[PDB]
Amino acid sequence: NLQKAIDLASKAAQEDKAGNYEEALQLYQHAVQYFLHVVKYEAQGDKAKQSIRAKCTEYLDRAEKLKEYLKN
């Protein structure tokens, strides 16, 4: 599950810089979904949760932004 979080989170951001948005938007939500998923069923410390959390916001922000700009 973890490998999917980064694999999905990496491909998502890779598309953001490349130019893609539709595929990056879907990957963004999916990638972030795995991040919180593992955290919900695997909480070691605060440093780990603090990292995924901060990353979940940045990625989530782009998703909501692209979805808006894409429709607007």
Binding site: V32, L36, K49, E64
Partner: peptide, 14 residues
């Protein structure tokens, strides 16, 4: 965690 978690549920919903 409450804000980030809610964000996902918001974006991912149909």
């Amino acid at each position: 965690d409450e804000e980030i978690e809610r964000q996902l549920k918001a974006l991912g919903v149909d």
